[PDB]
PDB file of C-alpha atoms and ligand atoms in Angstrom:
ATOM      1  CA  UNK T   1      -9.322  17.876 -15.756  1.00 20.36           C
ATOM      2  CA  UNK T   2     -10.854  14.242 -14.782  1.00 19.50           C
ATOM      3  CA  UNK T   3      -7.889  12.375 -16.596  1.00 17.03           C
ATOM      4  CA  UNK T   4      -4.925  13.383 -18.937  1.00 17.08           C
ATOM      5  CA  UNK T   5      -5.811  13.321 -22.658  1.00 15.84           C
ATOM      6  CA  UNK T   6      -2.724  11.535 -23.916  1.00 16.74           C
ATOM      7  CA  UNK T   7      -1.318   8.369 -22.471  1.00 13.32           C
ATOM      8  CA  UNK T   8       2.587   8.965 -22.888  1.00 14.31           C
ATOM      9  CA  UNK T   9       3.210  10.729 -19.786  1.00 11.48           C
ATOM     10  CA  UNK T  10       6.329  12.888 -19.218  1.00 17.87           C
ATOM     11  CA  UNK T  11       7.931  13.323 -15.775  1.00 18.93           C
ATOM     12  CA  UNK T  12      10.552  15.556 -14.643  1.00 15.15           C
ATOM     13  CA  UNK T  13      12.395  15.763 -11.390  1.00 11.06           C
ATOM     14  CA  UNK T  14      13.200  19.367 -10.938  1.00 11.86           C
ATOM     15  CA  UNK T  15      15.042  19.095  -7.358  1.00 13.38           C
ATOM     16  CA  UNK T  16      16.217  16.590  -4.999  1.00 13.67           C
ATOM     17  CA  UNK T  17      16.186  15.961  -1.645  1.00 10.76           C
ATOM     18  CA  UNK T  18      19.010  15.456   0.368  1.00  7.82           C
ATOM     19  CA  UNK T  19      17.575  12.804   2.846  1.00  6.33           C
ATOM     20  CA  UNK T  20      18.455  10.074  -0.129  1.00  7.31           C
ATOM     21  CA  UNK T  21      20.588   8.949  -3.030  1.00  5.97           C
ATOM     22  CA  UNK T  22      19.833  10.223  -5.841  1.00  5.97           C
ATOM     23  CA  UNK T  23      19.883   6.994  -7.575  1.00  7.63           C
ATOM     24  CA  UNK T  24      17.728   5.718  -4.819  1.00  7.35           C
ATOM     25  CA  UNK T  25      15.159   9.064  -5.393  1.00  5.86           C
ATOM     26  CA  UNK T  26      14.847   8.123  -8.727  1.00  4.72           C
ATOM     27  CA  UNK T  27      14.312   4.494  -8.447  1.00  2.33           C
ATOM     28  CA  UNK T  28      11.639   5.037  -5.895  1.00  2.00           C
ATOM     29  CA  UNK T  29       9.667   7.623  -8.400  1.00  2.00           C
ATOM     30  CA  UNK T  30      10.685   4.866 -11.061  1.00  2.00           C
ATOM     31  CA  UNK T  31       8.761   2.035  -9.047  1.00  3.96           C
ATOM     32  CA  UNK T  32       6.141   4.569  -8.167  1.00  4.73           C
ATOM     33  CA  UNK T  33       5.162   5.225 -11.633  1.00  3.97           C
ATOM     34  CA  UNK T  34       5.962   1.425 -12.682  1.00  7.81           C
ATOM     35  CA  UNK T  35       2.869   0.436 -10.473  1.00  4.50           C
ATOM     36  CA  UNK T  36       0.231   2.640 -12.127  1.00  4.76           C
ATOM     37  CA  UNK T  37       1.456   1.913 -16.112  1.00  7.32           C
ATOM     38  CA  UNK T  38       1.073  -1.784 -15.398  1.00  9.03           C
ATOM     39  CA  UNK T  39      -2.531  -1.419 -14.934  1.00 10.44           C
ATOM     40  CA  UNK T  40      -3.233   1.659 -16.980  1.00 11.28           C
ATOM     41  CA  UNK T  41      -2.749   2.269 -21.164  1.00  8.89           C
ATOM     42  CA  UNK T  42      -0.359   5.227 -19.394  1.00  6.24           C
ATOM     43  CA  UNK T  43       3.924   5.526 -19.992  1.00  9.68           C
ATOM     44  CA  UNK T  44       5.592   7.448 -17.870  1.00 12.11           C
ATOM     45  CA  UNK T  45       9.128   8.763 -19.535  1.00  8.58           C
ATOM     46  CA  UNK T  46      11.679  10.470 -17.319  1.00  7.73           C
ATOM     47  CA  UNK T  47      12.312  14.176 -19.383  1.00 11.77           C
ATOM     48  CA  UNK T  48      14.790  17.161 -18.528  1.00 11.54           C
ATOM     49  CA  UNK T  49      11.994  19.515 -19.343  1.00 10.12           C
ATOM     50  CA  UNK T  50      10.023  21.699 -17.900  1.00  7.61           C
ATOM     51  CA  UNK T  51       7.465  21.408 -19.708  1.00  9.68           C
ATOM     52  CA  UNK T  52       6.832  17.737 -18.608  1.00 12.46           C
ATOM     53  CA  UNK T  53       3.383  17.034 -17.773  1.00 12.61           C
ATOM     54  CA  UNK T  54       4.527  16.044 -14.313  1.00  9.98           C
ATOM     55  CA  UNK T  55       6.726  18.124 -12.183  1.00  9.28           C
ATOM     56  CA  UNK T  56       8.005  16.668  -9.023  1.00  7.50           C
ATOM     57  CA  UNK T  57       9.434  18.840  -6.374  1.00  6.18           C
ATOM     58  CA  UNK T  58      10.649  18.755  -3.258  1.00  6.01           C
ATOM     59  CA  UNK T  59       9.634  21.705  -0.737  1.00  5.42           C
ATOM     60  CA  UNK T  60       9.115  23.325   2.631  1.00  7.34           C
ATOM     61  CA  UNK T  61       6.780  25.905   3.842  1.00  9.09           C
ATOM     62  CA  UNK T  62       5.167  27.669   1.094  1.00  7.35           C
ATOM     63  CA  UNK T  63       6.754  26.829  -1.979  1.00  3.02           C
ATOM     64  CA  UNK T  64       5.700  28.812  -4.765  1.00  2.00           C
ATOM     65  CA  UNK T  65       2.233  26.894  -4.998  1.00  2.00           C
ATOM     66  CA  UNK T  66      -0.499  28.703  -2.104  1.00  2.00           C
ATOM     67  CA  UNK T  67      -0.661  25.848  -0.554  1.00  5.32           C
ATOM     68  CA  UNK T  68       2.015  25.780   2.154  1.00  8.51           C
ATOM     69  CA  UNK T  69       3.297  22.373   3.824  1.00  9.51           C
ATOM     70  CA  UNK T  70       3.563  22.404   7.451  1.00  9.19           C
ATOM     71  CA  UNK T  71       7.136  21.149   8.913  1.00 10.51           C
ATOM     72  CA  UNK T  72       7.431  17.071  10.225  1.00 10.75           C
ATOM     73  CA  UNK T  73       4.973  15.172  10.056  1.00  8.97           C
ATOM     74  CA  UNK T  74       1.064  16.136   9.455  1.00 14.14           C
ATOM     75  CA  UNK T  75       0.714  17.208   5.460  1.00 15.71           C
ATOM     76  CA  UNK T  76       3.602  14.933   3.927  1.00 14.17           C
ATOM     77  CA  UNK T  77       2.917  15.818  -0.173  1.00 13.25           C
ATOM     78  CA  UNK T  78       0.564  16.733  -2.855  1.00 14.99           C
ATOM     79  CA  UNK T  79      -0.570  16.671  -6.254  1.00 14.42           C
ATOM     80  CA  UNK T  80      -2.554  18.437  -8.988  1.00 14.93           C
ATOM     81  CA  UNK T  81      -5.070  16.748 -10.723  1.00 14.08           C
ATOM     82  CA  UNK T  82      -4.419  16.223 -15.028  1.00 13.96           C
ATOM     83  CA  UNK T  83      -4.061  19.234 -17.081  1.00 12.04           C
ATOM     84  CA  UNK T  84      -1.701  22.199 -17.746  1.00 10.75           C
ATOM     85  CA  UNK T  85       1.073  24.056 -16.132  1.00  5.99           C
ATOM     86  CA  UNK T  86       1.009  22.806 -12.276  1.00  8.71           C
ATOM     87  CA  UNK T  87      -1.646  20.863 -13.029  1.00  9.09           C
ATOM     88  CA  UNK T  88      -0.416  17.212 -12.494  1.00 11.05           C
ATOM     89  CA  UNK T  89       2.124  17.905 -10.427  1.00 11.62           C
ATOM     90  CA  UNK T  90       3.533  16.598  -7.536  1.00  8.48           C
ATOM     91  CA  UNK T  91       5.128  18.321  -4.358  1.00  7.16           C
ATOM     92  CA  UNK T  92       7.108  16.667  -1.393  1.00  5.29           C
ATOM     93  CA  UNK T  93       7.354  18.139   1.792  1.00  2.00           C
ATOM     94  CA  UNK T  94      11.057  17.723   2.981  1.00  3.76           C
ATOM     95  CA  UNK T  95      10.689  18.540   6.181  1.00  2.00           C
ATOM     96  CA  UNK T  96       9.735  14.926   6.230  1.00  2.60           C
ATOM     97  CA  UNK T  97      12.672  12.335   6.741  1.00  2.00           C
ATOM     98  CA  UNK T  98      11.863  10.308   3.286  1.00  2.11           C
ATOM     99  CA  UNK T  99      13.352   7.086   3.536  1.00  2.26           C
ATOM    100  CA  UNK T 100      12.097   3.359   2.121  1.00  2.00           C
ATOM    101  CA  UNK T 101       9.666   3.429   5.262  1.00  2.00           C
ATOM    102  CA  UNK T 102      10.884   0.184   7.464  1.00  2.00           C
ATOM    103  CA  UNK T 103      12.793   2.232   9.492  1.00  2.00           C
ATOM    104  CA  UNK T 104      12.485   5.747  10.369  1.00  2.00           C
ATOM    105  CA  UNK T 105      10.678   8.632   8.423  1.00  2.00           C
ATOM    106  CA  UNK T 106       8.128   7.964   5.134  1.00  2.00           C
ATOM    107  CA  UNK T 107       8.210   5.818   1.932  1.00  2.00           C
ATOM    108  CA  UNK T 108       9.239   7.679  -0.612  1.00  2.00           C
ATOM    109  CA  UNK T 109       8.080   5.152  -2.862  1.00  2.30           C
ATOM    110  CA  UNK T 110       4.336   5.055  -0.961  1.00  5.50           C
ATOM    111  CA  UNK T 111       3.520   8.327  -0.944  1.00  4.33           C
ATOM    112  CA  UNK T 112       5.009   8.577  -4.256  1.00  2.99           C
ATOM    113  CA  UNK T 113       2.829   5.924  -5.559  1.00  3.75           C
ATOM    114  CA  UNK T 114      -0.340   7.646  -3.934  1.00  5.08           C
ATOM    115  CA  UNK T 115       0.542  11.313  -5.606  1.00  4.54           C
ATOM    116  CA  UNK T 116       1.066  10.059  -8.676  1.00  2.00           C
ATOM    117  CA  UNK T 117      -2.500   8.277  -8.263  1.00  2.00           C
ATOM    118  CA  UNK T 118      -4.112  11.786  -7.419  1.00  2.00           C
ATOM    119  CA  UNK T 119      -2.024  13.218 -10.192  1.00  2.00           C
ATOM    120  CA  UNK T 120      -3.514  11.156 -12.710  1.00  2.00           C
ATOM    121  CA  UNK T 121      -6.975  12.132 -11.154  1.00  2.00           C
ATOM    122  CA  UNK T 122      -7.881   9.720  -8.505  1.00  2.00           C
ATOM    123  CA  UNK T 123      -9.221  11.086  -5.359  1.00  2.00           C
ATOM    124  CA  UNK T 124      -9.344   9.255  -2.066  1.00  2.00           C
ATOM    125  CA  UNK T 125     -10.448   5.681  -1.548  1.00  2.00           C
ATOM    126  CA  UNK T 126     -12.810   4.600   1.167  1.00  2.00           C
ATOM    127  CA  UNK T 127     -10.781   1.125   1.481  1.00  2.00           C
ATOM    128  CA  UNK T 128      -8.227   1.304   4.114  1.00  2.00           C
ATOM    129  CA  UNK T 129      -6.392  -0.879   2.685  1.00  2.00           C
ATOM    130  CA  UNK T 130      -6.426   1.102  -0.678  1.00  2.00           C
ATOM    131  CA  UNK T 131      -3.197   3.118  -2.017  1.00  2.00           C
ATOM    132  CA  UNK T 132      -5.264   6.068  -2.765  1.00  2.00           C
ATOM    133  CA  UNK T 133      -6.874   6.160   1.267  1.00  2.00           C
ATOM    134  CA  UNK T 134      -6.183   9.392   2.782  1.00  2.00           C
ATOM    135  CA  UNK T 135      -3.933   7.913   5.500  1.00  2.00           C
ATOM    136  CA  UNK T 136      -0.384   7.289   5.232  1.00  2.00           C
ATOM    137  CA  UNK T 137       0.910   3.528   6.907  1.00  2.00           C
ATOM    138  CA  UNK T 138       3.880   1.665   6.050  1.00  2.00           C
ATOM    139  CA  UNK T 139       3.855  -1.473   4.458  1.00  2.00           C
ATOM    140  CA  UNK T 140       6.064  -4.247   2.303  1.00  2.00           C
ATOM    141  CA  UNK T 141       3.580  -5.805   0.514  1.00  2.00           C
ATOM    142  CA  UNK T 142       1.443  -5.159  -2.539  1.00  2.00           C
ATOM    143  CA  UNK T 143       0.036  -1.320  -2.640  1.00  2.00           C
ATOM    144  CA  UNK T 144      -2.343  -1.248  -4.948  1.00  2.00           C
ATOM    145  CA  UNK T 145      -6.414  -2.678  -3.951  1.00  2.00           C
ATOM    146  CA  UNK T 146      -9.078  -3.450  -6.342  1.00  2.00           C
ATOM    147  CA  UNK T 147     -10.944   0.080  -5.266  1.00  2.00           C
ATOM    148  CA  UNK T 148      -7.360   1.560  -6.530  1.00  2.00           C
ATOM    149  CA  UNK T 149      -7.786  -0.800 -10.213  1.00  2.00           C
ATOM    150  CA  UNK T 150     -11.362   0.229 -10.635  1.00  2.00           C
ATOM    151  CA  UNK T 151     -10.491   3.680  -9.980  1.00  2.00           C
ATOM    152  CA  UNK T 152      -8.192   3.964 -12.515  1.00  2.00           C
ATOM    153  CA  UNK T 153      -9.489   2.186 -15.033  1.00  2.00           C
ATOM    154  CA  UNK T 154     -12.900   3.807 -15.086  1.00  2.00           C
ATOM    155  CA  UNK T 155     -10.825   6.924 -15.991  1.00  2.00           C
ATOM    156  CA  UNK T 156      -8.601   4.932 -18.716  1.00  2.00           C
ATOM    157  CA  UNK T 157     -10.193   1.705 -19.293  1.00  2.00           C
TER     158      UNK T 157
HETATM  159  C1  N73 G   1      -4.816  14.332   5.671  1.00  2.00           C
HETATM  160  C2  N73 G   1      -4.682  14.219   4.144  1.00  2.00           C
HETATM  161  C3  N73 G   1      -6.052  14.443   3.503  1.00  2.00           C
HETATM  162  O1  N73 G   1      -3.720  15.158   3.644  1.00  2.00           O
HETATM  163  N1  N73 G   1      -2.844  14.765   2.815  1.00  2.00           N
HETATM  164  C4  N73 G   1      -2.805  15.463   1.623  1.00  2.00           C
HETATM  165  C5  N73 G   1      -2.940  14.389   0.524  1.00  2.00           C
HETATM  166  O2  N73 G   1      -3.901  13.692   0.486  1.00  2.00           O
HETATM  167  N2  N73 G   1      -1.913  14.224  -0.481  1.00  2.00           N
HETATM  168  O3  N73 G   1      -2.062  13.409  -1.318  1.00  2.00           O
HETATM  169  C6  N73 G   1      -4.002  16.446   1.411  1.00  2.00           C
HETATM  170  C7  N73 G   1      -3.806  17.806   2.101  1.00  2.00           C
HETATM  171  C8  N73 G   1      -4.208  16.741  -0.074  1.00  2.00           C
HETATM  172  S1  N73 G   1      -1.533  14.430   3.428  1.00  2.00           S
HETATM  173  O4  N73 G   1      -0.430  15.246   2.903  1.00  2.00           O
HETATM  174  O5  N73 G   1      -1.629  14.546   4.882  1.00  2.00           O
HETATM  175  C9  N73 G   1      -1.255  12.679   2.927  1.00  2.00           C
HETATM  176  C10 N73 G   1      -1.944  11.631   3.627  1.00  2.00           C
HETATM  177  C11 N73 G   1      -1.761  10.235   3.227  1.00  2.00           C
HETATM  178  C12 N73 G   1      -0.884   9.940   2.141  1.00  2.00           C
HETATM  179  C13 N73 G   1      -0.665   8.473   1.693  1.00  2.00           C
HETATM  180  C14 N73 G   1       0.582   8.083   1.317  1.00  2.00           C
HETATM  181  C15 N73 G   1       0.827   6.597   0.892  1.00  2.00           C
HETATM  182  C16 N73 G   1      -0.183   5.703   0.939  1.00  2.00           C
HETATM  183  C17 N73 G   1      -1.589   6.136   1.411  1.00  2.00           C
HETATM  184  C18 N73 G   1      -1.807   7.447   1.784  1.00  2.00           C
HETATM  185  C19 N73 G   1      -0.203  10.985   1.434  1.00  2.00           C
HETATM  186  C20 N73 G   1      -0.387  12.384   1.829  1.00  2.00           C
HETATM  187 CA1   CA G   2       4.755  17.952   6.884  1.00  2.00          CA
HETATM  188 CA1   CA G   3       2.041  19.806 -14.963  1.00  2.00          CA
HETATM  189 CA1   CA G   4      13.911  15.903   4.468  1.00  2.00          CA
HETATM  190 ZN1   ZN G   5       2.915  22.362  -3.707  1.00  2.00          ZN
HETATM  191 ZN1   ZN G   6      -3.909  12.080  -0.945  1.00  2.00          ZN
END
């Protein structure tokens, strides 16, 4: 689907990675989701469910899904546009180091924000500077671009 029908979005961690905290994991998919529902009519509620409409998982390889992630570096993580099932759901490749990005390894909380932008049905932005462009670099300052706004909002106002 182009968007998700309702706007009180459930979420639902089903594994962790070992690279982090778990405290810290969820924090980062916290923030993540934190910076799309301040600019969309969208909620995002944390559930112990699987039948959330967002599943996150972390993975290596093939993981259940056909689409197979690759070892370090190259594919990092994906996600399913809105609808049922897998459908807006979200996969992490842990063969990555995740991390908060200054350092070493990826931003958990960047590439988080970006999947959870293709999960609620963006595809990828033409302005580099843009959350949802199609290459991953590390920054500390504010994510989201106008391209990412207007995106969004044309699918929920
Ligand atoms: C080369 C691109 C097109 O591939 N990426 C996947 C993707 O787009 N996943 O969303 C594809 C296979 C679906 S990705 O995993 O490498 C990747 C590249 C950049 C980012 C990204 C992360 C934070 C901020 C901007 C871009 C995330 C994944
Ligand atoms: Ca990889
Ligand atoms: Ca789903
Ligand atoms: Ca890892
Ligand atoms: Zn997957
Ligand atoms: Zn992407």
């Amino acid at each position: 689907d182009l968007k998700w029908h309702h706007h009180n979005i459930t979420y639902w961690i089903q594994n962790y990675s070992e690279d982090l905290p778990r405290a810290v994991i969820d924090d980062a998919f916290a923030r993540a989701f934190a910076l799309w529902s301040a600019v969309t009519p969208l909620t995002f509620t944390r559930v112990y469910s699987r039948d959330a409409d967002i599943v996150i998982q972390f993975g290596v390889a093939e993981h259940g899904d056909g689409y197979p992630f690759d070892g370090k570096d190259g594919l990092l993580a994906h996600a399913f546009p809105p609808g049922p099932g897998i459908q807006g759901d979200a996969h992490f490749d842990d063969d990555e180091l995740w991390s908060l990005g200054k350092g070493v390894g990826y931003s958990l909380f960047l590439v988080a924000a970006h999947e959870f932008g293709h999960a609620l049905g963006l595809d990828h932005s033409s302005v580099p500077e843009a959350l949802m462009y199609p290459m991953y670099r590390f920054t500390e300052g504010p994510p989201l671009h106008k391209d990412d706004v207007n995106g969004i909002r044309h699918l929920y106002g």
